[PDB]
Amino acid sequence: SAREQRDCEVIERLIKSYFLIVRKNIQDSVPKAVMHFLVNHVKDTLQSEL
């Protein structure tokens, strides 16, 4: 099929576009989680821990 291949190409474009949106968000999301749950946490906890 050819028409369906063209429809598949549309799907591929939708996949790429949405994926990149998701990935872009992840690029900021993770760092923040690490800072929040690990870095900033122990930054304050350690004193009481020690």
């Binding site: 369906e4 591929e12 992840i26």
Partner: protein, 51 residues
């Protein structure tokens, strides 16, 4: 002491030069074999007919 990047901005490096770039290398068209996708959408239809 001036030396290898560490402690602070090294993590900034991790969150950009390492991590950000790492993600930039991922896909976005990876795995997308047109023909396999055509199979996948046939599977997505399933036992029924489709418009």
């Amino acid at each position: 002491e001036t030396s290898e990047l560490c402690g602070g901005a090294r993590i900034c490096y991790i969150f950009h030069e390492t991590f950000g770039r790492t993600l930039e290398s991922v896909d976005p068209l990876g795995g997308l074999n047109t023909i396999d996708i055509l199979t996948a959408i046939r599977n997505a239809t399933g036992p029924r007919p489709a418009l």
